[PDB]
Amino acid sequence: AIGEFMVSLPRMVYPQPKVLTPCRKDVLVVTPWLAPIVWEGTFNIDILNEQFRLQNTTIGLTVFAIKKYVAFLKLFLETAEKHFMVGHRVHYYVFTDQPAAVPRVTLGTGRQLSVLEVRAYKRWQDVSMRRMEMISDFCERRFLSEVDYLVCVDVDMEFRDHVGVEILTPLFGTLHPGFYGSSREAFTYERRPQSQAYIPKDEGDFYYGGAFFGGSVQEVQRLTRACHQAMMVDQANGIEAVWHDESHLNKYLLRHKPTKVLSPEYLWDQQLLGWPAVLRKLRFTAVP
Amino acid sequence: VSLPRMVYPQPKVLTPCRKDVLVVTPWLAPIVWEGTFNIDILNEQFRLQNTTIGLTVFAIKKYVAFLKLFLETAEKHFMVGHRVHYYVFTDQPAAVPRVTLGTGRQLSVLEVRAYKRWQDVSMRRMEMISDFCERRFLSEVDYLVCVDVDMEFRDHVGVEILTPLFGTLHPGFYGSSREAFTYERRPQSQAYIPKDEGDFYYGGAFFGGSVQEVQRLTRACHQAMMVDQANGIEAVWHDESHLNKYLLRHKPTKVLSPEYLWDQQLLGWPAVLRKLRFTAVP
Numbered sequence: 001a002i003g004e005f006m007v008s009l010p011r012m013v014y015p016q017p018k019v020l021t022p023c024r025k026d027v028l029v030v031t032p033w034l035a036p037i038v039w040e041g042t043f044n045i046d047i048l049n050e051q052f053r054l055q056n057t058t059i060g061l062t063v064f065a066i067k068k069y070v071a072f073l074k075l076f077l078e079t080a081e082k083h084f085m086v087g088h089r090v091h092y093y094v095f096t097d098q099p100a101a102v103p104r105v106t107l108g109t110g111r112q113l114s115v116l117e118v119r120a121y122k123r124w125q126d127v128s129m130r131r132m133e134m135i136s137d138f139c140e141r142r143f144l145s146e147v148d149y150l151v152c153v154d155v156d157m158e159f160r161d162h163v164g165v166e167i168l169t170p171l172f173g174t175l176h177p178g179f180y181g182s183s184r185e186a187f188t189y190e191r192r193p194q195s196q197a198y199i200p201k202d203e204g205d206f207y208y209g210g211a212f213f214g215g216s217v218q219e220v221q222r223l224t225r226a227c228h229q230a231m232m233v234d235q236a237n238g239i240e241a242v243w244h245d246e247s248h249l250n251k252y253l254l255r256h257k258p259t260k261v262l263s264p265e266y267l268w269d270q271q272l273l274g275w276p277a278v279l280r281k282l283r284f285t286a287v288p
Numbered sequence: 289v290s291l292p293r294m295v296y297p298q299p300k301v302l303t304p305c306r307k308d309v310l311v312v313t314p315w316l317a318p319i320v321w322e323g324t325f326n327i328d329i330l331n332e333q334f335r336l337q338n339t340t341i342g343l344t345v346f347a348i349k350k351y352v353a354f355l356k357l358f359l360e361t362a363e364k365h366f367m368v369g370h371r372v373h374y375y376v377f378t379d380q381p382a383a384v385p386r387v388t389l390g391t392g393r394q395l396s397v398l399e400v401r402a403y404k405r406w407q408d409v410s411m412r413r414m415e416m417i418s419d420f421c422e423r424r425f426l427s428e429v430d431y432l433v434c435v436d437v438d439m440e441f442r443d444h445v446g447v448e449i450l451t452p453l454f455g456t457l458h459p460g461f462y463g464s465s466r467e468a469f470t471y472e473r474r475p476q477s478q479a480y481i482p483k484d485e486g487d488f489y490y491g492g493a494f495f496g497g498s499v500q501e502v503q504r505l506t507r508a509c510h511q512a513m514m515v516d517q518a519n520g521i522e523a524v525w526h527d528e529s530h531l532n533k534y535l536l537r538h539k540p541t542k543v544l545s546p547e548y549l550w551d552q553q554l555l556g557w558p559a560v561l562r563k564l565r566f567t568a569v570p
């Protein structure tokens with residue numbers, strides 16, 4: 001459930017926070033609208049685990065494994081079992097055009113998997129963009145009844161380290177690994193004013209990655225519905241945004257600020273970008 | 289909420305403004321210091337919800353003398369541009385000064401009984417706030433902010449503080465280790481906190497949050513005080529001891545820095561304080 005009020009914790013023994021001696025001095029750990037930016041060294045997972053377990057929190061994790069991408073499912077799910085929300089209730093939702101191709105993966109207690117059979121679009125761009133419609137539709141059909149939070153990711157990925165309840169909040173985006181140190185002028189936003197995804201050169205907080213966002217079911221439903229509607233307007237105007245669903249996600253999160261932002265620890269490509277000292281952990285990485 | 293177009297400086301992921309202080313708690317609540325927030329963005333967010341902030345103050349006996357300066361300075365500095373409702377609890381309704389209010393701001397005077405012991409005045413604020421959450425606040429304001437009266441605003445105190453539940457770092461202890469915190473240490477008291485527990489020492493003079501969370505906090509503190517009283521014990525720092533026990537077990541969703549609760553006579557103006565926003569009056 002998502003409790004209405006603050007939860008009451010038991011006695012716990014842990015290191016005292018140090019007001020005058022911050023651990024992370026190398027990165028921004030809070031946005032200008034006071035949302036935390038989640039990096040290793042900013043959170044005590046023991047405190048957060050207690051808070052979320054006291055509410056019997058259930059987390060849904062969506063992936064789209066359409067056409068040849070079914071091949072990524074085995075590694076995605078096996079690594080998720082090792083690293084994603086361990087100790088909490090988890091419900092995997094695999095959207096696929098090939099239910100028979102979903103691999104057998106043994107799950108820990110309190111974790112389950114649903115296979116959602118959906119149509120495959122011809123263009124990869126359309127497969128990627130129609131995720132928004134499909135997520136929104138299923139919020140109404142299944143997710144509002146089944147889970148408290150939804151985490152929506154790309155399937156061509158693997159978990160390498162802890163990804164846990166520190167990410168949970170009403171609405172989050174993730175810093176795209178290619179742009180976390182870039183000026184907003186270098187952000188690859190949609191720059192064409194005719195598109196619903198338009199963002200001018202003098203606007204933008206961050207470039208968020210389309211491959212990892214989430215929130216409460218209600219906020220995810222609203223985000224995905226808004227992005228799908230904006231994509232349909234663009235379609236009617238004969239326009240396709242430069243980076244598809246990611247461009248629309250960026251426009252949405254510019255105008256509706258996320259309540260947490262995840263650092264690139266949560267979305268990385270190690271072959272392309274190596275392992276900068278600013279990244280103490282690589283948690284969720286692209287599969288070649 | 290859906291924001292209109294705004295132009296402001298881009299946040300810088302690799303070049304944080306505050307490197308001298310902790311700006312987030314281990315449970316991922318921001319700690320509010322100058323340099324961590326853009327008030328333009330936050331003002332938009334809260335105005336779009338037509339946010340009303342209630343501010344409670346208890347002005348009992350001779351403390352009514354602090355009201356004029358408290359209210360005049362609140363008019364310059366507290367939530368300017370938002371709807372404000374002042375709730376002045378006093379034993380002397382006729383002694384409340386006439387203070388001219390800006391548009392969208394109102395004041396209600398609530399008559400209450402004066403206790404003889406200053407400790408009792410301070411502690412019974414918990415019962416009265418909790419009772420008034422039900423009688424009035426829940427139907428009148430969105431957030432409640434609960435402060436001492438013997439104070440003045442000297443700089444901006446705005447919507448950056450608003451959240452479901454907040455406490456404020458006590459200005460005498462922000463640099464102290466938990467062993468030095470003046471928590472209640474007797475296990476006989478409901479406010480008991482062991483030497484190996486505690487995140488921060490929160491000041492009793494500035495807390496708040498949504499009406500529902502404030503009603504819960506103040507109710508719990510009052511009940512714990514009543515238990516202590518039945519057991520013949522009074523916590524070392526009264527309401528503040530109970531507030532600290534409550535916020536230890538129910539983590540606040542924002543923590544305010546001591547910019548928000550200061551005494552310049554006792555503590556000066558250290559480099560770590562870029563602004564002194566709300567300060568004790570001598």
Ligand SMILES: O=c1ccn([C@@H]2O[C@H](COP(=O)(O)OP(=O)(O)O)[C@@H](O)[C@H]2O)c(=O)[nH]1
Pocket residue numbers: 063064065066067068069070124127128153154155156211
């Ligand atoms: O034929 C396809 C194309 C894409 N996708 C889904 O859409 C996501 C985004 O596509 P992709 O990962 O190729 O985008 P990229 O990371 O390369 O920018 C994939 O991870 C899949 O989850 C899919 O299932 N089948």
Ligand SMILES: O=c1ccn([C@@H]2O[C@H](COP(=O)(O)OP(=O)(O)O)[C@@H](O)[C@H]2O)c(=O)[nH]1
Pocket residue numbers: 345346347348349350351406409410435436437438493
């Ligand atoms: O006789 C009293 C005692 C206290 N108070 C209220 O209770 C708060 C706490 O009292 P005090 O300011 O003396 O506490 P201190 O800051 O000295 O610890 C005051 O600010 C007032 O708002 C009051 O009005 N009259």
Ligand SMILES: c1ccc(-c2nsc(N3CCNCC3)n2)cc1
Pocket residue numbers: 154155156157177178211267268269272273285286287
């Ligand atoms: C520059 C451009 C892209 C990336 C990048 N990292 S992960 C990723 N994806 C998209 C494909 N699906 C898996 C997630 N892409 C990094 C730097």
Ligand SMILES: c1ccc(-c2nsc(N3CCNCC3)n2)cc1
Pocket residue numbers: 436438439459460493549550551554555567568569
């Ligand atoms: C050491 C001890 C107390 C303080 C201190 N700052 S403000 C404050 N109060 C309590 C009295 N009412 C006004 C608010 N007290 C500072 C340093």
